[PDB]
Amino acid sequence: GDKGIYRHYMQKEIYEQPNAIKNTLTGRISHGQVDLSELGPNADELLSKVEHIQILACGTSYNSGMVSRYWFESLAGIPCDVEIASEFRYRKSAVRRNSLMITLSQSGETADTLAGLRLSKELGYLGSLAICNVPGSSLVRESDLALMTNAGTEIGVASTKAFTTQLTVLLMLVAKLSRLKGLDASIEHDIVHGLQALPSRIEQMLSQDKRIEALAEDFSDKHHALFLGRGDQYPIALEGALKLKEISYIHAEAYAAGELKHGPLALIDADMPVIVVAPNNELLEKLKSNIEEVRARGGQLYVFADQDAGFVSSDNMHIIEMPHVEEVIAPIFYTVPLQLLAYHVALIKGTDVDQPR
Amino acid sequence: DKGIYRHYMQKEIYEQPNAIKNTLTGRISHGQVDLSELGPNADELLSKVEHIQILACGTSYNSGMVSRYWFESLAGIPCDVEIASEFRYRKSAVRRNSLMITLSQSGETADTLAGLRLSKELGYLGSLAICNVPGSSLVRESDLALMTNAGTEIGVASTKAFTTQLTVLLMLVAKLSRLKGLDASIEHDIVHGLQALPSRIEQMLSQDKRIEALAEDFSDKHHALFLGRGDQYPIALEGALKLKEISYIHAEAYAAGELKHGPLALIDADMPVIVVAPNNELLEKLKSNIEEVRARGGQLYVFADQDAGFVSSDNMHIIEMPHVEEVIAPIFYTVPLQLLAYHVALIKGTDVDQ
Numbered sequence: 001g002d003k004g005i006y007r008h009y010m011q012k013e014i015y016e017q018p019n020a021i022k023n024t025l026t027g028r029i030s031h032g033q034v035d036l037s038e039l040g041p042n043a044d045e046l047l048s049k050v051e052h053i054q055i056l057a058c059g060t061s062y063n064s065g066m067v068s069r070y071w072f073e074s075l076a077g078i079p080c081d082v083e084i085a086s087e088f089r090y091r092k093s094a095v096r097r098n099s100l101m102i103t104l105s106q107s108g109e110t111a112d113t114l115a116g117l118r119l120s121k122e123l124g125y126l127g128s129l130a131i132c133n134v135p136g137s138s139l140v141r142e143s144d145l146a147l148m149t150n151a152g153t154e155i156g157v158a159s160t161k162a163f164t165t166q167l168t169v170l171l172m173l174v175a176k177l178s179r180l181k182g183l184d185a186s187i188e189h190d191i192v193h194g195l196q197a198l199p200s201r202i203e204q205m206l207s208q209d210k211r212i213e214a215l216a217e218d219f220s221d222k223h224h225a226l227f228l229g230r231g232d233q234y235p236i237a238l239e240g241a242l243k244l245k246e247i248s249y250i251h252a253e254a255y256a257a258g259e260l261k262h263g264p265l266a267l268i269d270a271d272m273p274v275i276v277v278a279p280n281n282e283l284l285e286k287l288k289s290n291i292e293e294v295r296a297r298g299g300q301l302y303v304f305a306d307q308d309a310g311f312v313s314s315d316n317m318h319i320i321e322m323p324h325v326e327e328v329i330a331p332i333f334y335t336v337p338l339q340l341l342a343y344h345v346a347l348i349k350g351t352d353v354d355q356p357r
Numbered sequence: 358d359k360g361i362y363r364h365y366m367q368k369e370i371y372e373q374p375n376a377i378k379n380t381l382t383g384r385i386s387h388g389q390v391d392l393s394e395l396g397p398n399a400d401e402l403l404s405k406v407e408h409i410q411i412l413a414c415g416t417s418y419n420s421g422m423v424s425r426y427w428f429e430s431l432a433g434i435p436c437d438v439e440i441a442s443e444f445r446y447r448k449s450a451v452r453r454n455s456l457m458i459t460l461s462q463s464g465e466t467a468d469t470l471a472g473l474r475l476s477k478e479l480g481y482l483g484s485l486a487i488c489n490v491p492g493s494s495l496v497r498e499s500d501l502a503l504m505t506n507a508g509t510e511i512g513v514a515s516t517k518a519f520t521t522q523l524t525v526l527l528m529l530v531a532k533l534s535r536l537k538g539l540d541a542s543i544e545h546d547i548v549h550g551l552q553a554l555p556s557r558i559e560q561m562l563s564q565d566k567r568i569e570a571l572a573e574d575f576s577d578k579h580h581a582l583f584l585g586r587g588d589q590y591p592i593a594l595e596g597a598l599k600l601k602e603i604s605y606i607h608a609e610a611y612a613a614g615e616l617k618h619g620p621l622a623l624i625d626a627d628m629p630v631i632v633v634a635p636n637n638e639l640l641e642k643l644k645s646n647i648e649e650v651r652a653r654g655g656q657l658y659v660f661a662d663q664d665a666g667f668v669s670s671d672n673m674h675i676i677e678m679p680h681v682e683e684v685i686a687p688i689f690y691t692v693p694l695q696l697l698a699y700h701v702a703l704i705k706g707t708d709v710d711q
C-alpha cells in the first residue's frame with residue numbers, strides 16, 4: 001500500500017469508496033438483477049425459508065446492521081432485529097421462528113460476535129450468514145453462508161470503505177430476499193439501479209470536500225457535537241458521531257431527530273455544533289421542524305442537505321449542498337460527508353488519522 | 358405540598374415504596390398476579406400473543422427496554438421496543454400475532470398515539486396501554502389498559518412514573534408466563550420480588566447521606582458516563598437521562614461491554630463513571646469492564662450489591678446496596694441514581710421542582 005497522491009491513508013480510503021463499492025458489486029449484478037450464486041446451489045433453499053433476520057455486530061458494523069433493518073422491513077418485508085453482540089451473547093433471548101443469523105465483522109474474529117454465532121448453533125436458528133472482509137476467518141468458516149465485502153485493507157484508524165461496502169452487501173441481500181419471497185421484481189430493479197449509480201454519486205459529492213474542510217475549522221475550539229437523523233438516516237448519524245469520537249476525541253453523540261425534547265435540547269447552546277443529514281424524502285419537512293428546534297435554541301447547525309431541499313445558509317446554519325441521490329442508497333451516500341468531516345476535524349486538532357506504519 | 362420533604366422531587370423519590378405498593382394494590386392474590394381489571398376478554402387476546410411491540414418515548418421508552426429483557430427471558434416472548442417518532446413513519450414488517458403495548462405517563466403523547474392508530478391499520482392482534490391517566494386517548498383507544506396508580510409528579514423529572522411503569526410491566530410478564538403454561542416458579546419469583554421491593558427501597562434510602570456526600574464530587578463536573586449490562590443497560594440510560602435533565606451535565610450511557618468504541622479514550626480523571634452492579638451472572642464480566650475504566654483513571658461510583666464483593670479505594674467509590682431479588686433489580690437500582698441526580702442538581706443550584 002502506497003498513498004499515491006493522497007496525504008493520509010484515511011483520505012485515500014474515503015476517496016476510493018467509489019472503486020471499493022464497484023469491487024463489492026463485481027460479479028454480483030447481472031442483467032439488472034442481483035446474482036448471489038457464490039453462495040452455492042443450497043442457498044435459495046435456506047434463504048427462502050427465512051421469516052426473521054437477527055443481526056449481531058458491534059461498533060461501526062452495528063450501525064450498518066441498523067441501516068439494513070429499515071431496508072429488510074420496508075423493501076423485503078422481513079422482520080429484522082439488530083443487537084450488540086456483547087449483550088446478546090449473555091442474555092436469554094426468545095426464539096424467533098425461522099430466523100437467519102447474520103454476523104457483521106470486518107476481521108471475522110470479533111470475539112463477542114463470534115461468541116454470539118457459536119451460541120446461535122445451540123438455539124435453533126435456521127442458519128447463519130457472515131458478512132465479512134477477511135476470507136477464511138472464524139466467522140466465515142463457522143457460518144453456513146458467507147458474503148465478502150471486497151473492501152481491501154484499511155490503514156486509517158477507523159473504518160470508512162469497510163462500512164459502505166457492508167451496507168452495499170446488505171442491500172444486495174435485501175434485493176435477493178425480496179425476489180426469493182415472490183415480491184415485485186421492481187424492488188430488486190430499483191435497488192440494483194441505485195447501487196449501479198452509487199459510485200458516481202459519491203464521486204459527485206467529493207467535490208464538496210473542501211467546503212467540509214473549511215467548515216471543520218469551526219470545530220477547532222469545540223469538544224462536543226450532536227448528530228441528528230431520522231428514519232434510515234438515524235444510524236448514519238450514529239455512525240457520524242462514532243467516527244468523530246473515535247478519530248477526534250470529541251464528545252459526539254447522536255439522537256433520532258424527533259426526540260430532541262428529552263434532554264439534548266436543554267444542553268444545546270451557541271457552543272454546541274449540531275450536524276444533520278437531510279436527504280430530500282418524505283421525512284424532510286418533519287426534519288426541518290427538528291432543525292428549527294435547534295436553530296431557535298442557538299445551536300450551530302451543519303446541514304448536509306439535498307441541493308433542492310430549500311435550506312438557506314444563515315449565521316448559525318451552514319448548508320453543505322449534496323447532489324441528488326436515489327433514496328435506496330441515500331444512507332450509504334450520506335455517510336461519506338460525515339467521514340470527511342471527522343477526518344478534517346481530527347487533523348485540525350492534530351490527532352492521527354492513520355495507524356502507525 | 359411537601360409535608361416533611363424539602364422538594365417535591367425528594368418526596369417523590371422517598372415515596373416510591375408507597376407508590377409501588379399502590380401499583381400492586383388489588384393485583385396480587387394467593388401468590389399469583391391478578392389482572393382481572395383488564396376485563397373478561399383479556400385472556401384470549403393475551404393467550405394469542407407471539408410477539409410484543411412496545412412504543413414509547415423518553416422515560417417510558419427506557420422502561421419499555423427494561424421489559425424487553427423480561428418478556429424474552431421470563432415469558433419467552435419476542436419483544437421489540439421502538440421510539441414512536443421513528444415507528445409511525447417507517448414501513449415496518451408486521452410480526453404474526455403481535456401485541457402493541459404503549460407506555461405513556463399522560464396518555465396523550467402524539468407520536469405514541471399515532472403509532473397505536475397505525476397498529477390497527479396494520480393488522481396487529483391487539484393493543485394494551487400502560488398509563489397513569491384514566492380516560493386518556495391511549496387508554497380509550499387500546500383494547501386493554503392498566504393504570505400505574507402513581508399519583509401526581511411535580512418534580513421536573515419522572516421519578517415514580519418510571520418505577521411504577523416497570524412494576525406494571527413485570528406483573529404483565531408474570532401473567533403472560535402463566536397464560537403460556539411456563540413454570541409457575543416464574544410468577545412466584547416475580548410476586549416474591551414485587552412484595553419485597555418497597556422494603557428494599559426503604560433499606561436503600563439509608564444510603565442517602567453517602568450519596569449526598571459523593572454528589573459533592575460532581576460540583577465541578579460537566580461530563581459523566583453511565584455503565585450497565587443486560588437488563589441494567591436501560592437503567593444506566595435512564596440514570597444518564599435524569600442527570601442530564603435536572604443537572605445539565607452531559608451524561609451518556611453505554612453497554613459496559615462496548616467501552617471499546619469511543620468511551621474508553623474519553624475517560625480521564627475528570628470523568629465520573631457511574632455503574633449499577635447487581636449480584637448476578639454478568640457481575641464478573643462487569644467487574645472486568647470496571648477494571649478497564651479504573652485503569653484509565655476514570656473515577657468510579659459503583660452502586661453495588663453488598664454481596665458483590667467490591668472494596669472502596671481512592672478511585673472507586675462503592676455505594677453498598679441491600680441484597681436484591683434479581684427480577685426487581687432494574688426497578689430497585691433506578692432509585693439510587695434518582696437520588697444521585699437529585700443531589701447533584703441541588704449542589705449545582707438547579708431547581709428540582711417545576
Ligand SMILES: [Zn+2]
Binds near residue numbers: 058059
Ligand atoms: Zn466491538
Ligand SMILES: [Zn+2]
Binds near residue numbers: 262414415466
Ligand atoms: Zn416524547
Ligand SMILES: [Zn+2]
Binds near residue numbers: 224251580
Ligand atoms: Zn464538555
